[PDB]
């Protein structure tokens, strides 16, 4: 049955490629089918169980091609809790929006581009299903060649250096992640997201293991020593690469610090949270300050994403239920509101004028009133202006970080000010003034751009008016990672 579904489906695909040159209609169709499938899975999800509900094993020895019903299991496990399914819902409603986001600008070799974008989306979808450390790690770096090819073939003038940096920095942190994963797999002889809180390592073996995982998380939720590939890989990517990156990869490393570190490095983690607070306060302040002198326009939103991830990390590392919940709300709400900003700068503003320097853009209200409406609504939604989901995440993460250490909570609370300075400094320059003498007047915002914007604004407003709507997934996982004896 299940094989006949697939070679029906492969024949479906071959015939519509034979009769239609493009793929994008079928990729949109498969994306929305994947949406409906994940929401049917959410209907059948048991919230009253802490355990992993929809389990499957791939590449077992008794059945290498397909599912596994065995006494012995050495393949790759997959399955979800509420924590996984939160990010799966966030991922699956963003994949059609990034396929839709480049519906007209990619002209030359379209089918390659849409295949790469859908492939990256599928890899990141399967990242949240994984249940081994090696099964997490394999999909965790399957993205990188596709990102390299996507950034190198499509982009601006400088897409060679950006493609190199997205392979280089990510690979360089993630190799030390592999070091710690190998040490875990030779001590425990098991890599598993199920059993791994039962095993207790020695304190100085834990403090050796924890370093390599935290270095990779410092590279990928980019904290201050290496926060540095991120503005260039944003500022020189195509549109769906930027959107998928800043909506999903950074939140994937935010998911990895919960899933991989907090269960079997508890006694290490307590010894190291002051160092994490040094690094996260120091990547809030110094990056939020370095945004004030920026000549380019996508680079400002890249540095914004740094500062918001720095707020979220002191939520997960807070040893508080409030901080864990607020970091999850911040990750999901940021994954909504930031790709809308990258669409504002890269889609409505780079398709029309093909330059990204700030000095050309002035007085956009008088020819584009509803674009300007979007720009100011998204600016305030990005700041931490409430009823938005960004303030719920920032408020609960700042509260957890105040519980764990009140002085670094006191100096971390100024991120409310620092995040608003550069954002409103950009927004009043874009909206205010006489219309630019460099810009000739173009079209106002189109139906598909307004469609993407309206979806990404409603989904922040619903979380911002009621953050309880996703507590039913998280109330286990908010208690799961707390170590208060």
């Amino acid at each position: 049955f299940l094989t006949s579904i697939l070679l029906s489906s492969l024949y479906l695909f071959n015939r519509i490629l034979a009769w239609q040159g493009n793929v994008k209609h079928f990729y949109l169709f498969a994306s929305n089918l994947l949406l409906l499938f994940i929401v049917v899975l959410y209907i059948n999800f048991n919230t009253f169980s802490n355990s992993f509900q929809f389990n499957f094993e791939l590449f077992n020895s008794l059945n290498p091609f397909g599912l596994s019903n065995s006494d012995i299991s050495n393949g790759l496990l997959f399955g979800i809790d509420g924590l996984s399914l939160t990010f799966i819902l966030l991922t699956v409603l963003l994949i059609p929006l990034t396929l839709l986001g480049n519906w007209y600008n990619i002209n030359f070799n379209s089918n390659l581009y849409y295949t790469l974008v859908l492939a990256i989306g599928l890899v990141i979808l399967l990242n949240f299903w994984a249940l081994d450390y090696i099964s997490f790690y394999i999909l965790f770096e399957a993205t990188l060649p596709l990102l390299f090819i996507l950034i190198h073939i499509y982009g601006s003038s400088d897409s060679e250096r950006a493609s190199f940096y997205v392979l280089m920095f990510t690979l360089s942190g993630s190799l030390f992640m592999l070091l710690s994963i190998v040490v875990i797999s030779i001590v425990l002889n098991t890599t598993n997201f199920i059993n791994h809180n039962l095993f207790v390592l020695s304190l100085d073996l834990q403090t050796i293991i924890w370093l390599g995982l935290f270095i990779a998380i410092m590279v990928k939720t980019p904290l201050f020593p290496i926060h540095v590939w991120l503005p260039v890989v944003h500022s020189e990517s195509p549109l769906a690469g930027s959107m998928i990156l800043a909506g999903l990869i950074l939140k994937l490393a935010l998911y990895a610090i919960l899933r991989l570190l907090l269960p079997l490095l508890c006694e290490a983690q307590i010894l190291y949270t002051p160092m994490i607070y040094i690094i996260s306060l120091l990547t809030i302040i110094l990056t939020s300050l370095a945004t004030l002198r920026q000549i380019d326009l996508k680079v400002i939103i890249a540095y914004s994403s740094i500062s918001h991830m720095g707020i979220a990390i002191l939520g997960v590392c807070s040893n508080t239920s409030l901080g864990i919940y607020g970091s999850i709300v911040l990750g999901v709400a940021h994954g909504f509101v930031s790709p809308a900003l990258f669409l504002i700068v890269g889609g409505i503003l780079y398709d029309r004028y093909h330059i990204r320097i700030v000095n050309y853009y002035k007085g956009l209200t008088t020819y584009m009133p509803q674009l300007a409406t979007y720009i100011i609504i998204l600016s305030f939604a990005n700041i931490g202006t409430p009823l938005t989901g960004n303030f719920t995440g920032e408020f609960l993460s700042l509260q957890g970080g105040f519980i764990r250490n009140p002085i670094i909570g006191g100096i971390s609370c100024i991120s409310v000010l620092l995040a608003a300075i550069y954002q409103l400094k950009l927004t009043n320059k874009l909206t205010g003034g006489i219309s630019s003498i460099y810009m000739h007047r173009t079209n106002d915002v189109t139906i598909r751009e307004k469609f993407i914007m309206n979806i990404l604004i409603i989904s922040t407003l619903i979380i911002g008016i009621c953050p309880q709507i996703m507590y039913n997934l998280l109330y286990w996982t908010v208690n799961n990672y707390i170590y208060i004896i």
Partner: protein
């Protein structure tokens, strides 16, 4: 414990081995070259090689043994300080201050990462996972390095971590109970 180092004589021995290594490398550069070269161009057209060898040898072993005698314990920090001194000597041939500082800090970081892994190219035998007790403890004992248990002693948690943040010598539940 530890016993104090012979900074005097280890530094003399290091100056001897650096002098010999400079002799050998200057002879090697003499033999592997072009042009009019004779027997006493070994120390004129050497490129300053004996200075490199002896200066690095004196600097590293002096700073290593001095830092281990000043700190009165032996770990990888002494390799950090001695590599910083070696990077100072190797960076002074660069007559430039920022490159000098770069040589100092980066050679000290590389040598400290070297000395923290054991300061050995090869392996240690009994420290290996292959030649150590591993797996579960089979009954309750002092859990060694490379070993796994199911539950840890809470007294070890209080002594190693602290009595502060969320961590206490008795859980919050039974500290607050009705009788």
């Amino acid at each position: 414990h530890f016993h104090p180092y012979n900074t005097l004589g280890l530094a003399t021995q290091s100056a001897m081995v650096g002098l010999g290594a400079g002799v050998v490398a200057a002879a090697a550069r003499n033999s592997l070259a072009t042009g009019p070269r004779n027997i006493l161009t070994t120390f004129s057209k050497s490129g300053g090689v004996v200075t490199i060898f002896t200066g690095a040898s004196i600097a590293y072993v002096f700073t290593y043994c001095s830092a281990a005698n000043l700190r009165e314990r032996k770990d990888g920090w002494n390799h950090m300080w001695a590599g910083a001194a070696t990077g100072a000597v190797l960076g002074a041939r660069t007559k430039l201050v920022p490159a000098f500082i770069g040589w100092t800090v980066l050679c000290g970081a590389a040598c400290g990462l070297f000395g923290w892994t054991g300061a050995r190219f090869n392996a240690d035998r009994k420290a290996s996972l292959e030649q150590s007790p591993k797996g579960f403890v089979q009954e309750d004992a002092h859990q060694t390095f490379w070993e796994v248990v199911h539950r840890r002693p809470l007294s070890l948690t209080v002594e190693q971590l602290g009595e502060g943040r969320g961590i206490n010598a008795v859980p919050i539940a039974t500290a607050t109970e009705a009788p």
